[PDB]
């Protein structure tokens, strides 16, 4: 099976054959396509390690030797003993890094194999995954030239003792509903703050308060904790040329960091996973600055630069957009923050996606998540056909877990 | 079965039915999704019920499902194919399904004007002149000297595939390309090939940046036929900037008049080849897709070079600046001109708009996020965060492949 892509750009076309060893279901049919929708025992898992034991033996060049046997002996055992099984440091360290190389949302992945794994699995405490934290976070930051890492906590078990982050990002903003009925702060984590509130934090009610981290040890109720300030680097954002910028008192944080996925490695679930890159510059100054959702600040942007505002046709949201956009990726270069602009990085995933149609047989890659927010066309993915599928290793979104925790 | 949409900025959530009435095949299985891949005679037997189908749907539209009129019909086309082996469609149900070939086209963001569409029923002609005459006439009455309608015009069916009608051209009015032996190319990149055929048929090519394409038309499975569109029905509209008075300099203009040619309009089991059809522009397709790709025009190193840009690094992001000035440029060119033109917040706005009203009245809207979405500024459009559903109904336009691939030369 044999499946061609073409880039309308080049005419140059490749051929998958990766996609064969998909597993998991995309939610499309025959029918329905579904791709722009974002949330699309004993006896089962030993297949699955099987499946994953084979792909690590063979990545070490070492399929059908002595050792693959005997550790696939040992695995079989350890499943009809005790019901699961632990993965070996270079069994670790490999899944993390092909769970990344899996995310076919993820426009960064020419980085792949540079990851630093943490193995936090003898972690046993909510005090324990506090320390780990933060040193990943010192890790990954490295005083502005970031680094890509993971620390990776104990795997389910029954499923009523998961360690959990219950923070959607490492690092993040609270948000706050006034009595004048707008937001303060970043709008996407007034739920998340209220229960830090009701948990017992005290808030400083301000437009960029770090929020504290609430972590899930052993299934126990989340405790809070606050990252030390001194580790949380951030960045003011200011214009190369206008001025007046600095006044809108903008700021983010340097480090982008995942805290709510699953990780599955083998059949094993890993509920903590928290992952860190560095940014791509659209993701601040157009998701995070100018989604209506959000700090939503187009308007305010545009006001300062006079334009005319009357008329959609004027293309004064477009003008702003850019704007800030220039401010971002000027800030965090001047202040010496790893960051990459959107021109960059695509370029880069193209090289990366043609590196792995040689070397692998294909690359899933999910259109509608890799080119950027804005300037799409102008870019070297847009032009790019892409198929998306699913294989494991992988991370997987998994609901807020104030939706499923009974305190 | 229901199916949800959520738009992910307003939290608003939608749920589609009209699904269930989706026949073809996308593409996509359980293991694989090809959302991003741009291209994904009948017999008796399957033709009468794709007939049934259409006219269940067409009647059921005017309130006579059931009705004498209805089941006559039936009969009416039931012997017809029997006896024939293809039917005629009544002038009704051509502009129903025409219509409604627009409404159900996925990758169609101006779908909020699907009902107001010129039908020019061409069914009558016989000769490739016919087929100019007919063209000529469409394209001036689109035109409308700037207040630009929607029309379609619609040539005989398909019988036996060996007498197909073919505009060749893939748009009614497109520019000539040209290779030059230094491997640079003059004009539209895109047209190459086309226009190389245009001058072995016998074209006097002028051999500049923006020449008018002749029209290469094909009746009855004859060999094409080449001839130009009278010059004085071909709006063009000068590109220049409301500030920068460079931007004239450039020597760049385009067409007003958007006009696809090559596609396949499927009636009730029913085949049009030929059936040209045309809008008016979304301001980016010209600034962003034909000035700015790297395959067309490709203007915005020139641009941001008269901009005095910095160019040395990509996170300057000169080529995002060059290319909101360009938009605008075309966007004021158009208005000043009086041509009708949207801009890309004004159309995804009444998109949405649309496809909210056809959940409500329809159950559904099948849509291509990757097309809708438009090439620049996506997220801040309010299709960005909308969630859509894409599945094929009929009546429906189709993509066929160039008829200088497949032709059989008579000589
Ligand atoms: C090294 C620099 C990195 C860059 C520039 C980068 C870039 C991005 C971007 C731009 C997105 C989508 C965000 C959006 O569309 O708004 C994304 C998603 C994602 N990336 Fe990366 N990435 C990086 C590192 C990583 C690392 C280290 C991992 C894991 C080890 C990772 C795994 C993922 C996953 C799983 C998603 C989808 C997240 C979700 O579903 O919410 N990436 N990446
Ligand atoms: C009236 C104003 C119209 C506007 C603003 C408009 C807008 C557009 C745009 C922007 C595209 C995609 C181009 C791209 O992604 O670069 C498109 C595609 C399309 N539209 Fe429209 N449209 C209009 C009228 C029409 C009409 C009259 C018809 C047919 C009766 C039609 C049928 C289609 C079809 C079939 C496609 C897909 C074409 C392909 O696959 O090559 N549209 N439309
Ligand atoms: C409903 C829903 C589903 C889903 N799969 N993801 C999300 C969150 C999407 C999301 C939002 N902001 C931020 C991210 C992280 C993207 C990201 C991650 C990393 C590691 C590096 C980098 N530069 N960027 C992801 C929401
Ligand atoms: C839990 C949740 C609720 C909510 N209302 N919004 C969100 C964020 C949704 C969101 C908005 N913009 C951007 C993203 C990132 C993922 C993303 C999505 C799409 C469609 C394109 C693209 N390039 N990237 C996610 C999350
Ligand atoms: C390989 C391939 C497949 C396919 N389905 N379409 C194409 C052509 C895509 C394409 C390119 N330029 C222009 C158009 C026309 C879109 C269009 C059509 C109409 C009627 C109005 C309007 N404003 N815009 C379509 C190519
Ligand atoms: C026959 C043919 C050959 C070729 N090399 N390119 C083309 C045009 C491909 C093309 C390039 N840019 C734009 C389009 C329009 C359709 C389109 C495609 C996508 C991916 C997104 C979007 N918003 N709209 C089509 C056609
Ligand atoms: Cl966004
Ligand atoms: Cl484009
Ligand atoms: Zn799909
Ligand atoms: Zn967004
Ligand atoms: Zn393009």
Redesign the interface.
């Known amino acids: 099976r044999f ?1 061609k ?2 880039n ?3 005419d140059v076309v490749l051929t998958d054959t990766l ?1 064969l060893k ?1 597993t998991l ?14 949330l699309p025992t004993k006896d089962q898992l030993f297949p699955l390690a099987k499946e994953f034991l084979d792909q690590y033996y063979s990545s070490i060049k070492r399929f059908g030797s002595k050792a693959h046997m005997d550790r696939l002996e040992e695995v079989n055992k350890e499943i009809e003993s005790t019901s699961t099984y632990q993965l070996k440091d270079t069994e670790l360290i490999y899944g993390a890094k092909h769970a990344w190389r899996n995310a076919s949302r993820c426009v960064g992945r020419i980085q792949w194999s540079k990851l630093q794994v943490f193995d936090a699995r003898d972690c046993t405490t909510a005090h324990g995954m506090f320390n780990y934290i933060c040193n990943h976070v010192k890790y990954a930051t490295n005083k502005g030239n970031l680094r890509s890492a993971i620390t990776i906590f104990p795997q389910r078990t029954d499923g009523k003792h998961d360690f959990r982050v219950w923070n959607s990002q490492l690092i993040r903003y609270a948000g706050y509903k006034q009595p004048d009925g707008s937001t303060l702060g970043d709008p996407a984590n007034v739920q998340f703050t209220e229960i830090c509130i009701q948990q017992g934090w005290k808030a400083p009610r301000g437009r960029f308060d770090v929020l504290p981290l609430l972590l899930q040890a052993n299934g126990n109720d989340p405790e809070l904790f606050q990252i030390p300030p001194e580790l949380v680097l951030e960045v003011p954002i200011r214009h190369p040329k206008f001025d007046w910028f600095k006044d809108l008192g903008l700021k983010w944080y340097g480090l982008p960091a995942v805290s709510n996925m699953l990780l599955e490695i083998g059949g094993l679930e890993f509920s903590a996973c928290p992952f860190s890159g560095w940014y791509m ?1 659209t993701e601040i100054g ?2 995070d600055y ?4 959000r700090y939503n600040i ?1 308007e305010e942007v545009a006001k300062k630069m006079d334009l005319d505002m009357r008329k ?4 004064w ?3 702003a ?2 704007e800030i ?2 401010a971002v ?1 000027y800030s965090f ?1 001047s202040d010496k923050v790893t960051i990459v ?1 959107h ?2 990085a695509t370029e880069s995933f193209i090289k990366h996606m043609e590196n792995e149609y040689r070397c692998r047989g294909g690359c899933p890659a ?3 998540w890799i ?1 950027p ?6 870019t070297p993915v ?2 790019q ?5 699913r294989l494991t290793p992988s991370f997987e979104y998994q609901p807020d877990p104030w939706n499923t925790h009974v305190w």
Do not use: A
């Open positions: 499946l892509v073409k309308w750009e080049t996609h998909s279901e995309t939610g499309c049919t025959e029918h329905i396509c579904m791709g722009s929708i974002m510059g157009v998701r100018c989604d209506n959702s187009l959609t046709s004027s293309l949201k477009d003008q957009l850019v956009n220039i990726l270069q602009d021109h960059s999910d259109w509608v080119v927010p804005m300037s799409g066309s102008i847009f032009h056909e892409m198929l998306n599928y």
